[PDB]
Structures are given as structure tokens and as C-alpha cells.
Subunit: 274 residues, 2 copies
């Protein structure tokens, strides 16, 4: 017992991971628990050796945001081990591990439901990598809220979740199709890309466009148009992850394996903050 | 020998501290150490107990962004002690400790000298807490670059490095004077404060105001006026700190005690971005 918990995440560069790490650090310190941050750079081999380096340092538990294909046999080593691995953001084997993930589907529905209330003839759904779950979960939540609505929705998918990729595709798409009144993006990076194109061409970012995006930024309040944004309950996430770590260490018999979900918060910015 | 280093910072929320922490863990992991983060919340009492805790966990060295004044009696305990204690951002005793700090005067002048080149008449320096060391140096640097300039500079000073303090003051000042043609802020928060009121009044962020700020943000690119931004070399700072940590462990002597000013990088945004 070193009264310490390993936390493996991609990097402390992403605000989402950092804010959760922030809330978790102040959470853990509060109970005389140290937190050991070992980043993977989202590389599988790095993660595996970040794990053992925590084990070498007599860590009491690990919290992981795994980059492996979860089933990958590495974590099946601790499948029936009382040593607790608690997953964050990206789930582990749902039969041998507790995982705190988000509720992308219900989130995407809520956000989509809200955007639809805005008048707009032409609508554009912009995502990326529909092969992935986060991409599909979000599309499904959206399609759910736009089921019996008459309006046609143009769907457009980029090769990656990047600013440049979105910029290129949206610009190419503007040749055939015209500018939309309503927009739905599944990451902030996509919206950036779309905005770059609108700053080009127009010179002026829009004041006649309902924006709806995943991820949140406070600087969206300066925009001249209505924007809707969803972001994680970073603190509420941290609480739940830690409660499970403590339950496994303290209580007799660990919590049930499987997913537990936490919904995002909606934010009305741009003109909706006035 | 645990092969571990303790970091003590205010929080994992401030951009600069997190980015520095990011580039520091990635470096520390490579050299084969494990950072332990302990946040003071910028409270003296907390800061002190953190160091008690980290020391108790057999840590090899500590990096600190201290909340205490440079020659506080608490850190005189390790003044002639060979156990390394390196200082980040906020400097410790300038003769018994080595401090990796910024070049606020140099950076201010550089940024100021750049801002001058635009054709403005009414230029406004907005700062906060003038008597503080950091506030002083930035006022100092600015005056150097606007020494022989034959143009007035109304200096305005908020009573906190905060957004609403800046806004109130500026809008109350905007009664007595007309709109500046150039502008110089001493933090990002003060720039926020100014833009809030400019978004009021005008209902639109300016397109003709030459802007110079401390602290960077990519989203400044979307502005439609000239923008100059200056921010830390997180990676340089991080790796140059850690170099001193290892030199203190390995080399038969402790390196020169004193300040090592690392200069900030300049970026161009708004219309300058495109």
C-alpha cells in the first residue's frame, strides 16, 4: 500500500483530459492519495510499458484510457485479478472491468433536438470516421431527433477528425451544394475547419447560422450567431471514477463490471448569451 | 533513490502550467523518472503541506511554482542542503536556488516595439496591480520601446488580473476618452474584459484595432483586426528545467544558483494569420 493511483491517458495537452485530471488530483489529494500521471501519447506499446512502470512502483490501482483494441489480450492478464483497473472515456472488457464512459448518443440527440428548433431550410451534418462508435453513436442520436421531421439533411464525412480535412471537404462541397443555415459538427476541430472557410470567402464569420457542436469553448460567446455546445461534466466524471477505485480497494467485493455513463452539459453561446 | 520528482503547481487548469506539465512528464518519462503532481491551489498553507507529503514519499527532487516571497524562511531549510529544489515561474532565493523564469521586461519591449509599427494615434496600455514585480517589469519594457516615440500613451490599470475588473474600468474610461487605435494588455484576461465591452457598444469585435497581449490562443486567428500574441516556450522551459534537475543529481556540483530568463515566442493572428 503506497496510497497512490496510476492514471494513464494520451496526454495533458487535451483540455478534456486535463480538466478531469485536475478535478481528480484535487479529489485524490483530499483523501491522502497520490496520483501518478503516465502518458501514452496514444501509443499501444507506450501504454503497456506505462502500465508496468506503475506496477514496478507498487501502485495500488490504475485508471486507464486505453488505446489498445480493448479485447487485446494485455488486459485479460488482470481479468480475474483483485487488482482494479478502472477505464475512463474508452471502455475495457465489459465483463471483467468497470468503465466510466460518456453518453454520446443521448448527448447527440439532445443537441440535435435543440438545433432543429431553429428555422433553417438547408442543414448539414459534418462528422468523421463513421466506422468508429463515437461517430455512429452521435449520428444515431442525431437521426433519432430528426426522425419524423420533413427537412432533408445533407451528411458529410471527413477522413479524419481534423481542421484541415474538414476545411478541404466543406470547401469542395460548397461548389455543388450552397451554404447551410443549420450546422451540426461532432468535434470542435471540424467546426474550426468550417469556420476557416467562412472567414475565407466571406471575410466575416457568420451572423446567420445555427451552429451545434461537440466540445465547448468559452470564446464561442463572441460569435455573432447562435451556437449550441456540449461538454463533459469533468468533475462529476472524476468523482465516479475515484469512487469505483476506492470501492475496489476498501469495500469487500468490487463493483459490478460494465459501463456507467455520464451525460454532457448543453451551452448556449454566441447571441444566446445575450 | 526512488527515481521520482515532485511537481508543485497552483492547478492543472491554467493553460501555461498544464502545457509545461505536459512537456515535463513526457520528458521525465523518457529519462526514466515519474513525476508526482501536488497542487497548492496557490495557497501557502497547502503548498507547504504538499512539499511535506512529497518529501515523505522519498522523492529525489522537487520543482515548485512557489506562492511565497523569494526569501521566505520556509525554504531556508534547504538553502545549503544538496537535495535539489528547482523553481518554476515564481523564483525562490536567487542565491541559494536556481529559478527558470520568464523575461517579462524583454518580452514586453519586444511586443511593444512590434505594436508601434502600426499607424495609431490613441494607444492604451491596460495592466493590473502595478506595484507587483511582474506588473512592474512589463510596464518597464513597454516604456523602453515607447521612449523616443512622440505619441501619448494613456496607461490604465485594473486592480486585478481579471476580466470583469478590466471591463468595468475600460467602459467607465470610454466615457472620458474615445476609442483607442492601438491597445496593449498585460494578460489574456484583460484582453477578454476589453473585448466584452467592444462586443457591447459596437455589437461586433473590432477590425481596425492593433492588439498586443500576453498569453496566446489559436482562436485569435479568427479576429479581423491585427493581433500580436506572446506566450511561453513550454517545451523549452520544461526541458531546460529538467536539465537543471538532473545536473543537480548527477554533476558533482549544483549548477549556478540564480535566474535563467527564457524568452517568450511571438505569434501573429487576426488578419495577420491570413
Amino acid at each position: 500500500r503506497t496510497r497512490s493511483i496510476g492514471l494513464v491517458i494520451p496526454d495533458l495537452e487535451n483540455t478534456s483530459y486535463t480538466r478531469i485530471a485536475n478535478y481528480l488530483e484535487r479529489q485524490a489529494r483530499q483523501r491522502g492519495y497520490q496520483l501518478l500521471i503516465a502518458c501514452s501519447e496514444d501509443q499501444p506499446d507506450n501504454e503497456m510499458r506505462c502500465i508496468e512502470h506503475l506496477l514496478q512502483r507498487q501502485v495500488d490501482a490504475i485508471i486507464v484510457s486505453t488505446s489498445l483494441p480493448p479485447e487485446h489480450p494485455f488486459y485479460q492478464r488482470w481479468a480475474n485479478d483483485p487488482f482494479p483497473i478502472v477505464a475512463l472515456d474508452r471502455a475495457l472488457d465489459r465483463e471483467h472491468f468497470t468503465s466510466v464512459v460518456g453518453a454520446d448518443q443521448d448527448d447527440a440527440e439532445m443537441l440535435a433536438e435543440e438545433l432543429r428548433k431553429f428555422p433553417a431550410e438547408t442543414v448539414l451534418y459534418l462528422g468523421a470516421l463513421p466506422e468508429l462508435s463515437v461517430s455512429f453513436l452521435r449520428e444515431q442520436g442525431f437521426r433519432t431527433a430528426w426522425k419524423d421531421d420533413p427537412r432533408e439533411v445533407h451528411f458529410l464525412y471527413a477522413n479524419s477528425y481534423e481542421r484541415e480535412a474538414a476545411a478541404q471537404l466543406f470547401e469542395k462541397w460548397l461548389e455543388t451544394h450552397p451554404m447551410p443555415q443549420a450546422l451540426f459538427t461532432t468535434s470542435f476541430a471540424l467546426l474550426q475547419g468550417v469556420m476557416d472557410v467562412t472567414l475565407r470567402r466571406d471575410g466575416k464569420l457568420p451572423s446567420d447560422l445555427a451552429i451545434a457542436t461537440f466540445g465547448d469553448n468559452e470564446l464561442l460567446d463572441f460569435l455573432q450567431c447562435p451556437v449550441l455546445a456540449v461538454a463533459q461534466r469533468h468533475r462529476d466524471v472524476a468523482e465516479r471514477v475515484l469512487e469505483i477505485v476506492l470501492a475496489s480497494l476498501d469495500e469487500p467485493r468490487k463493483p459490478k463490471p460494465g459501463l456507467t455513463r455520464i451525460k454532457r452539459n448543453l451551452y448556449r453561446r454566441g447571441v444566446l448569451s445575450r
